[PDB]
Amino acid sequence: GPHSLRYFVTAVSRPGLGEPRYMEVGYVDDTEFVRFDSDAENPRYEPRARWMEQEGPEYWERETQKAKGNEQSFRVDLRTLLGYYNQSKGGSHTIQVISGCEVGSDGRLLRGYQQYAYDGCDYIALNEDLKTWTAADMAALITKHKWEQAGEAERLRAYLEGTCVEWLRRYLKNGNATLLRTDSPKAHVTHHSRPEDKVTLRCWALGFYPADITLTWQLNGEELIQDMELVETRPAGDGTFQKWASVVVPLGKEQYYTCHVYHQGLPEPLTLRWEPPP
Amino acid sequence: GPHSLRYFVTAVSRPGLGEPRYMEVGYVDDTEFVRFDSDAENPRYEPRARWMEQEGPEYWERETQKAKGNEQSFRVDLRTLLGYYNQSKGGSHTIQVISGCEVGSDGRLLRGYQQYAYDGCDYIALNEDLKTWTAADMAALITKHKWEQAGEAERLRAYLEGTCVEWLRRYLKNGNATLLRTDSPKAHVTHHSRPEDKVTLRCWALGFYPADITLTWQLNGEELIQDMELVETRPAGDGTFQKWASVVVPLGKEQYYTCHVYHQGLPEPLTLRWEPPP
Amino acid sequence: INFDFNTI
Amino acid sequence: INFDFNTI
Amino acid sequence: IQKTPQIQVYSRHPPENGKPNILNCYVTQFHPPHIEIQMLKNGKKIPKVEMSDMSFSKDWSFYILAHTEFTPTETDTYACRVKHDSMAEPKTVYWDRDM
Amino acid sequence: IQKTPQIQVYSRHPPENGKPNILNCYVTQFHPPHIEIQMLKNGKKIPKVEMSDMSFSKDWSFYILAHTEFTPTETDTYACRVKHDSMAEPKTVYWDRDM
């Protein structure tokens, strides 16, 4: 399928408490592979996917120094935005960036992007065309004209169309062209009391990777989305994820309901019912 | 169908309470989409429908600037009208304008208009020929002179035929999806026991949108219109509307009357009868 | 967008 | 690898 | 020329005793725009009352909506009171469950 | 423009009384990123709680997983308490082993 190289940047000021916190995290298809954190004892670019241990000490030395230079830019950004938004030097503020490219199965670019946020709100973004910016408020307007003047979009474009793409392919190499590691869900149903002529059937999907999954409850072929309770998918802490969906049903009609689990690791979706222990 | 863009402008003096209160409200087909209020914290143009968030900071800036200019024009207007009618300096007074364009399904102007009022009474209006002014009273003739000769007929005609029509098309584009929404009324009849011998039947229509609706009671084929009580259509506060229509009928004859509910959201008009509750 | 008003 | 960022 | 306020007081949803609801006070047909609106519970002023923004319609008259959170019971009395230049006295309008 | 954290507390493995397990507190949908998370056994703070690295999602909001080693029993109550500026008060979410 498609593939992605994304970098997620965070700089957060903390007046009084010391210099801005600065973080760079890299992702190949949602999988974190490098990370920098300026609050570490020794601030360097560190491998986070063991397949990254393939790169030579130069790589790390040179991306570390890149992080340090980025930290300076964002630290100055923080100061600049206090001017733009007339904000106090004593408050805590956050800058975020998501930057990256998606290339196709053929290895061609399908989309370059770079998005900025300030205190959690969109600030400015590069358009589909890789040529123009979309500002979200008056302050971002000032940024947009400066960058248009400097032609920054042409320079970003070159990164996205080239550098980004080539390393994406390169990282895909090392981490295997389309690393679909896969643990299919182990599913089961539990049974729980309700205001007592009612019962709760809870369908569990456990130990699965990756996070994408779908559980449904069916009554005579129909999907009960109204009345289903769902939790957000969550990490077990060991690399896999968990989810459940529950349904409140009349006492004694448990066998009228079926749970369905859909996941790229499943040859065929799972079908299951409440089983009274034989 | 036809479509409209109108601006409703309010300026209210309040000597003893500070500066004139100034408001602009824009409507696309009777739906509020933007507003400026000079009394808010940090007054500027604001989106009033989610589909306006599409317009970027350039739009918000330019319309805010023009609101602030309009406000001065209207402040001066209040003073001028104080003298035109030789009134006291300490009285509160209101100017209102209704301004905009209605356009046919072909995109052609079906009629442009701009109406002013002072203290709730017509002051001047522009003619269905965008060329002349119908003045309503004394000092409105002066105004009409100034806008005639001094040439404001041309600047306003081009706004109305050009600028106004052009932006109306754009707002529909972004709007459309939401603008065309339609909630059909849910209806039912209640029963209320009256000055002994009689009963009131009340036909309710709830949860409908837009406000356009018609309710009638029928006694065997004939409509009672000249005999119902009916309330003005009213907002539910959640974006939908309510109305009821009621009739007094003899006890034991409730089943001879039918209530009819006409609304563009209806496949067919609803027809209903009082029901003895379960 | 609204009209730019001059005065009375 | 990441982009070399300039200032806003 | 001044115009007298019209008022309706009604709930957002079908009234159910003991069930949280919204009480509305819809005031229309008034000019000039200055107007004071209070909502009352058993003759006493309710402090938490929200006001929509003011609009005016094709005939120049103003309208606004006031509303408050409330939970009807069989015996609580509700009303909306409006003060306005067009009238000598403040006008109180009582909530009717069937209107 | 603060965002209120959402919280789940749940174990890594199916809980069985007397069998060592991991208890999780997964906090999401929050901004700014400053946050304090405590875990509690019977209202008392647990001393050694690990924090994952903080990450953020496409909507900009942050997430983090806190966890600690525990041996569930019949009656011990476990909870996660989160202090964040979006919220008037610290929020406490209790472990339910069926959830």
mmCIF file of C-alpha atoms in Angstrom, chain B residues 32-274:
data_model
loop_
_atom_site.group_PDB
_atom_site.id
_atom_site.type_symbol
_atom_site.label_atom_id
_atom_site.label_comp_id
_atom_site.label_asym_id
_atom_site.label_seq_id
_atom_site.Cartn_x
_atom_site.Cartn_y
_atom_site.Cartn_z
ATOM 1 C CA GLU B 32 -27.554 34.539 9.993
ATOM 2 C CA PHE B 33 -23.949 33.869 8.909
ATOM 3 C CA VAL B 34 -21.782 36.767 10.212
ATOM 4 C CA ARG B 35 -22.029 39.407 12.895
ATOM 5 C CA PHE B 36 -20.188 42.478 14.211
ATOM 6 C CA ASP B 37 -21.162 43.932 17.606
ATOM 7 C CA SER B 38 -19.403 47.072 18.880
ATOM 8 C CA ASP B 39 -20.169 46.096 22.478
ATOM 9 C CA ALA B 40 -18.357 42.741 22.522
ATOM 10 C CA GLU B 41 -14.871 42.275 24.041
ATOM 11 C CA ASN B 42 -12.601 42.850 21.012
ATOM 12 C CA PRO B 43 -15.248 43.723 18.395
ATOM 13 C CA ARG B 44 -14.790 42.249 14.959
ATOM 14 C CA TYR B 45 -16.625 40.316 12.273
ATOM 15 C CA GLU B 46 -17.436 36.800 13.400
ATOM 16 C CA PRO B 47 -18.677 33.687 11.595
ATOM 17 C CA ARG B 48 -22.096 32.600 12.784
ATOM 18 C CA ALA B 49 -22.313 29.398 10.761
ATOM 19 C CA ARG B 50 -19.632 26.704 10.716
ATOM 20 C CA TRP B 51 -19.314 26.973 6.931
ATOM 21 C CA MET B 52 -17.940 30.491 7.186
ATOM 22 C CA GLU B 53 -14.775 29.296 8.910
ATOM 23 C CA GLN B 54 -13.528 28.556 5.392
ATOM 24 C CA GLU B 55 -12.787 32.244 4.791
ATOM 25 C CA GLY B 56 -9.281 33.073 5.931
ATOM 26 C CA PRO B 57 -7.933 35.983 7.980
ATOM 27 C CA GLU B 58 -7.905 38.387 5.007
ATOM 28 C CA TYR B 59 -11.714 38.185 4.849
ATOM 29 C CA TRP B 60 -12.173 38.711 8.618
ATOM 30 C CA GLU B 61 -9.765 41.654 8.641
ATOM 31 C CA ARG B 62 -11.257 43.454 5.665
ATOM 32 C CA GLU B 63 -14.880 43.163 6.833
ATOM 33 C CA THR B 64 -13.998 44.196 10.392
ATOM 34 C CA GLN B 65 -12.270 47.269 8.966
ATOM 35 C CA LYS B 66 -15.353 48.116 6.928
ATOM 36 C CA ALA B 67 -17.655 47.555 9.949
ATOM 37 C CA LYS B 68 -15.543 50.057 11.916
ATOM 38 C CA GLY B 69 -15.870 52.525 9.025
ATOM 39 C CA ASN B 70 -19.623 51.969 8.751
ATOM 40 C CA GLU B 71 -19.921 52.614 12.513
ATOM 41 C CA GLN B 72 -18.382 56.102 12.101
ATOM 42 C CA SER B 73 -20.630 56.852 9.128
ATOM 43 C CA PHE B 74 -23.566 55.809 11.351
ATOM 44 C CA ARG B 75 -22.424 57.665 14.454
ATOM 45 C CA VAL B 76 -22.249 60.825 12.343
ATOM 46 C CA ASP B 77 -25.673 59.860 10.930
ATOM 47 C CA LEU B 78 -27.182 59.878 14.445
ATOM 48 C CA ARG B 79 -25.902 63.399 15.205
ATOM 49 C CA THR B 80 -27.074 64.624 11.823
ATOM 50 C CA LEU B 81 -30.541 63.201 12.355
ATOM 51 C CA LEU B 82 -30.679 64.774 15.815
ATOM 52 C CA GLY B 83 -30.590 68.181 14.093
ATOM 53 C CA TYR B 84 -32.636 67.366 10.990
ATOM 54 C CA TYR B 85 -35.501 66.769 13.443
ATOM 55 C CA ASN B 86 -34.158 69.265 15.994
ATOM 56 C CA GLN B 87 -34.191 66.898 18.951
ATOM 57 C CA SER B 88 -32.473 67.034 22.354
ATOM 58 C CA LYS B 89 -28.876 65.979 22.989
ATOM 59 C CA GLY B 90 -29.765 63.555 25.779
ATOM 60 C CA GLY B 91 -32.248 61.287 24.047
ATOM 61 C CA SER B 92 -31.662 57.759 22.777
ATOM 62 C CA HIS B 93 -32.216 57.109 19.054
ATOM 63 C CA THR B 94 -32.011 54.288 16.567
ATOM 64 C CA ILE B 95 -30.996 54.002 12.940
ATOM 65 C CA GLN B 96 -31.663 50.780 11.030
ATOM 66 C CA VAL B 97 -30.714 49.726 7.548
ATOM 67 C CA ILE B 98 -31.681 46.737 5.549
ATOM 68 C CA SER B 99 -29.424 46.307 2.563
ATOM 69 C CA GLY B 100 -28.819 43.628 -0.040
ATOM 70 C CA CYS B 101 -29.896 41.656 -3.041
ATOM 71 C CA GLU B 102 -32.313 38.906 -4.013
ATOM 72 C CA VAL B 103 -31.261 36.784 -6.989
ATOM 73 C CA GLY B 104 -33.040 34.377 -9.278
ATOM 74 C CA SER B 105 -32.069 30.745 -9.827
ATOM 75 C CA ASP B 106 -30.398 31.954 -13.006
ATOM 76 C CA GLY B 107 -27.976 34.036 -10.951
ATOM 77 C CA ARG B 108 -29.512 37.303 -12.125
ATOM 78 C CA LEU B 109 -30.533 40.117 -9.758
ATOM 79 C CA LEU B 110 -34.297 39.819 -9.113
ATOM 80 C CA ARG B 111 -34.180 43.054 -7.053
ATOM 81 C CA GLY B 112 -31.727 45.146 -5.018
ATOM 82 C CA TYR B 113 -32.766 47.290 -2.055
ATOM 83 C CA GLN B 114 -31.545 49.442 0.801
ATOM 84 C CA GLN B 115 -33.961 50.672 3.457
ATOM 85 C CA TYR B 116 -33.139 53.127 6.300
ATOM 86 C CA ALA B 117 -35.287 53.928 9.343
ATOM 87 C CA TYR B 118 -35.036 56.418 12.167
ATOM 88 C CA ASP B 119 -36.608 55.588 15.522
ATOM 89 C CA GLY B 120 -38.455 52.707 13.883
ATOM 90 C CA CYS B 121 -39.951 54.785 11.071
ATOM 91 C CA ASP B 122 -39.124 54.703 7.391
ATOM 92 C CA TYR B 123 -36.632 57.390 6.448
ATOM 93 C CA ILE B 124 -35.550 56.538 2.887
ATOM 94 C CA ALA B 125 -35.452 53.493 0.577
ATOM 95 C CA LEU B 126 -33.951 52.871 -2.861
ATOM 96 C CA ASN B 127 -36.221 52.120 -5.822
ATOM 97 C CA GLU B 128 -36.603 48.800 -7.616
ATOM 98 C CA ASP B 129 -34.601 50.482 -10.402
ATOM 99 C CA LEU B 130 -31.484 51.104 -8.306
ATOM 100 C CA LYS B 131 -31.548 54.698 -9.589
ATOM 101 C CA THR B 132 -33.946 56.762 -7.447
ATOM 102 C CA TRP B 133 -34.762 57.259 -3.754
ATOM 103 C CA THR B 134 -38.261 57.186 -2.260
ATOM 104 C CA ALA B 135 -37.982 59.578 0.712
ATOM 105 C CA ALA B 136 -40.591 59.041 3.439
ATOM 106 C CA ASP B 137 -40.705 62.457 5.092
ATOM 107 C CA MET B 138 -39.138 65.863 5.674
ATOM 108 C CA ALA B 139 -35.349 65.780 5.987
ATOM 109 C CA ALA B 140 -35.173 62.530 3.993
ATOM 110 C CA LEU B 141 -35.591 64.763 0.926
ATOM 111 C CA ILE B 142 -32.262 66.411 1.794
ATOM 112 C CA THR B 143 -30.616 63.015 1.998
ATOM 113 C CA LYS B 144 -32.218 62.042 -1.303
ATOM 114 C CA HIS B 145 -30.806 65.165 -2.895
ATOM 115 C CA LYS B 146 -27.297 64.371 -1.658
ATOM 116 C CA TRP B 147 -27.415 60.757 -2.884
ATOM 117 C CA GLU B 148 -28.976 61.793 -6.187
ATOM 118 C CA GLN B 149 -26.648 64.561 -7.339
ATOM 119 C CA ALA B 150 -23.532 63.794 -5.277
ATOM 120 C CA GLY B 151 -23.743 60.409 -7.020
ATOM 121 C CA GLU B 152 -24.158 57.510 -4.611
ATOM 122 C CA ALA B 153 -26.675 55.821 -6.898
ATOM 123 C CA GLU B 154 -23.827 54.396 -8.995
ATOM 124 C CA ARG B 155 -21.582 53.139 -6.162
ATOM 125 C CA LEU B 156 -24.559 51.339 -4.606
ATOM 126 C CA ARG B 157 -25.952 49.943 -7.859
ATOM 127 C CA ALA B 158 -22.661 48.237 -8.683
ATOM 128 C CA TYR B 159 -22.347 46.884 -5.158
ATOM 129 C CA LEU B 160 -25.879 45.580 -5.541
ATOM 130 C CA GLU B 161 -25.590 44.198 -9.080
ATOM 131 C CA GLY B 162 -21.871 43.382 -8.935
ATOM 132 C CA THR B 163 -20.216 42.826 -5.532
ATOM 133 C CA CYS B 164 -23.371 41.704 -3.704
ATOM 134 C CA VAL B 165 -24.473 39.137 -6.337
ATOM 135 C CA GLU B 166 -20.905 37.785 -6.688
ATOM 136 C CA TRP B 167 -20.481 37.140 -2.944
ATOM 137 C CA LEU B 168 -23.946 35.660 -2.615
ATOM 138 C CA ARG B 169 -22.929 32.908 -5.086
ATOM 139 C CA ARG B 170 -19.772 32.179 -3.117
ATOM 140 C CA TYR B 171 -21.542 31.878 0.282
ATOM 141 C CA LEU B 172 -24.100 29.448 -1.208
ATOM 142 C CA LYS B 173 -21.195 27.348 -2.517
ATOM 143 C CA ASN B 174 -19.587 27.046 0.913
ATOM 144 C CA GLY B 175 -23.027 27.009 2.498
ATOM 145 C CA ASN B 176 -25.277 24.831 0.344
ATOM 146 C CA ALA B 177 -24.759 21.587 2.302
ATOM 147 C CA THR B 178 -26.103 23.138 5.531
ATOM 148 C CA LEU B 179 -28.283 25.860 4.021
ATOM 149 C CA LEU B 180 -30.568 23.346 2.319
ATOM 150 C CA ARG B 181 -31.147 21.257 5.462
ATOM 151 C CA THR B 182 -34.784 20.689 6.315
ATOM 152 C CA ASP B 183 -36.344 19.249 9.473
ATOM 153 C CA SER B 184 -39.943 18.218 9.100
ATOM 154 C CA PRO B 185 -42.304 18.925 11.974
ATOM 155 C CA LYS B 186 -43.375 16.232 14.446
ATOM 156 C CA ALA B 187 -46.997 16.834 15.295
ATOM 157 C CA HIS B 188 -49.643 15.725 17.786
ATOM 158 C CA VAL B 189 -52.875 16.923 19.277
ATOM 159 C CA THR B 190 -53.558 17.638 22.954
ATOM 160 C CA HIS B 191 -56.915 17.973 24.688
ATOM 161 C CA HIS B 192 -57.932 20.520 27.312
ATOM 162 C CA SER B 193 -61.249 20.668 29.145
ATOM 163 C CA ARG B 194 -62.936 24.065 28.855
ATOM 164 C CA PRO B 195 -65.793 26.181 30.303
ATOM 165 C CA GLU B 196 -68.020 23.231 30.948
ATOM 166 C CA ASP B 197 -69.631 21.792 27.800
ATOM 167 C CA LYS B 198 -66.641 22.560 25.564
ATOM 168 C CA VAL B 199 -63.071 21.359 24.946
ATOM 169 C CA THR B 200 -59.958 22.849 23.301
ATOM 170 C CA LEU B 201 -58.032 20.802 20.751
ATOM 171 C CA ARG B 202 -54.494 22.057 20.202
ATOM 172 C CA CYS B 203 -52.402 20.953 17.280
ATOM 173 C CA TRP B 204 -48.653 21.130 17.887
ATOM 174 C CA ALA B 205 -45.843 21.170 15.391
ATOM 175 C CA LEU B 206 -42.372 20.728 16.913
ATOM 176 C CA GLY B 207 -38.741 20.348 15.931
ATOM 177 C CA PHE B 208 -39.085 21.715 12.416
ATOM 178 C CA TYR B 209 -36.887 23.914 10.219
ATOM 179 C CA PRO B 210 -37.049 26.303 8.545
ATOM 180 C CA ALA B 211 -39.717 28.452 10.282
ATOM 181 C CA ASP B 212 -42.014 28.493 7.288
ATOM 182 C CA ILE B 213 -45.117 26.434 8.287
ATOM 183 C CA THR B 214 -48.886 26.432 8.082
ATOM 184 C CA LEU B 215 -51.407 24.874 10.476
ATOM 185 C CA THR B 216 -55.167 24.572 9.958
ATOM 186 C CA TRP B 217 -58.090 22.824 11.590
ATOM 187 C CA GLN B 218 -60.805 21.312 9.443
ATOM 188 C CA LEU B 219 -64.385 20.468 10.282
ATOM 189 C CA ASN B 220 -65.448 17.961 7.626
ATOM 190 C CA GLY B 221 -63.762 19.380 4.517
ATOM 191 C CA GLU B 222 -64.065 23.052 5.556
ATOM 192 C CA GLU B 223 -61.192 25.077 7.110
ATOM 193 C CA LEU B 224 -61.927 27.027 10.288
ATOM 194 C CA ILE B 225 -59.208 29.696 9.904
ATOM 195 C CA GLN B 226 -61.630 32.474 10.898
ATOM 196 C CA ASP B 227 -61.917 30.648 14.243
ATOM 197 C CA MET B 228 -58.664 29.110 15.481
ATOM 198 C CA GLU B 229 -56.348 30.580 18.024
ATOM 199 C CA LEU B 230 -52.745 30.415 16.871
ATOM 200 C CA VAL B 231 -49.397 31.577 18.240
ATOM 201 C CA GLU B 232 -46.601 33.222 16.349
ATOM 202 C CA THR B 233 -43.961 30.674 15.230
ATOM 203 C CA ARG B 234 -41.238 30.568 17.862
ATOM 204 C CA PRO B 235 -37.711 29.196 18.257
ATOM 205 C CA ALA B 236 -37.030 26.160 20.404
ATOM 206 C CA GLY B 237 -33.614 27.579 21.163
ATOM 207 C CA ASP B 238 -31.859 24.602 19.597
ATOM 208 C CA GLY B 239 -32.164 25.808 16.012
ATOM 209 C CA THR B 240 -35.654 24.428 15.374
ATOM 210 C CA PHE B 241 -39.124 25.944 15.650
ATOM 211 C CA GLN B 242 -42.503 25.318 17.275
ATOM 212 C CA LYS B 243 -46.061 26.423 16.569
ATOM 213 C CA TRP B 244 -49.536 25.414 17.620
ATOM 214 C CA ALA B 245 -53.019 26.035 16.425
ATOM 215 C CA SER B 246 -56.083 25.458 18.568
ATOM 216 C CA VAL B 247 -59.849 25.208 18.244
ATOM 217 C CA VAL B 248 -62.808 25.032 20.683
ATOM 218 C CA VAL B 249 -65.240 22.217 19.895
ATOM 219 C CA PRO B 250 -68.223 20.492 21.638
ATOM 220 C CA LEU B 251 -67.466 17.754 24.163
ATOM 221 C CA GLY B 252 -67.854 14.376 22.515
ATOM 222 C CA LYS B 253 -67.233 15.801 18.987
ATOM 223 C CA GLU B 254 -63.437 15.764 19.029
ATOM 224 C CA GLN B 255 -63.343 13.097 16.302
ATOM 225 C CA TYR B 256 -65.054 15.301 13.737
ATOM 226 C CA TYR B 257 -62.064 17.698 13.525
ATOM 227 C CA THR B 258 -58.830 17.292 11.660
ATOM 228 C CA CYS B 259 -55.600 19.186 11.994
ATOM 229 C CA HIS B 260 -53.425 19.853 8.933
ATOM 230 C CA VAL B 261 -49.706 20.641 8.945
ATOM 231 C CA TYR B 262 -48.063 22.009 5.766
ATOM 232 C CA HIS B 263 -44.257 22.232 5.603
ATOM 233 C CA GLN B 264 -41.669 22.034 2.823
ATOM 234 C CA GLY B 265 -40.014 19.232 4.775
ATOM 235 C CA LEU B 266 -43.096 17.138 4.264
ATOM 236 C CA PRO B 267 -43.459 14.499 1.565
ATOM 237 C CA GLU B 268 -47.184 15.219 1.998
ATOM 238 C CA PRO B 269 -49.089 17.450 4.431
ATOM 239 C CA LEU B 270 -49.730 15.779 7.795
ATOM 240 C CA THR B 271 -53.326 15.041 8.738
ATOM 241 C CA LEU B 272 -54.140 14.315 12.400
ATOM 242 C CA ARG B 273 -56.926 13.727 14.878
ATOM 243 C CA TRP B 274 -57.146 13.866 18.594
#
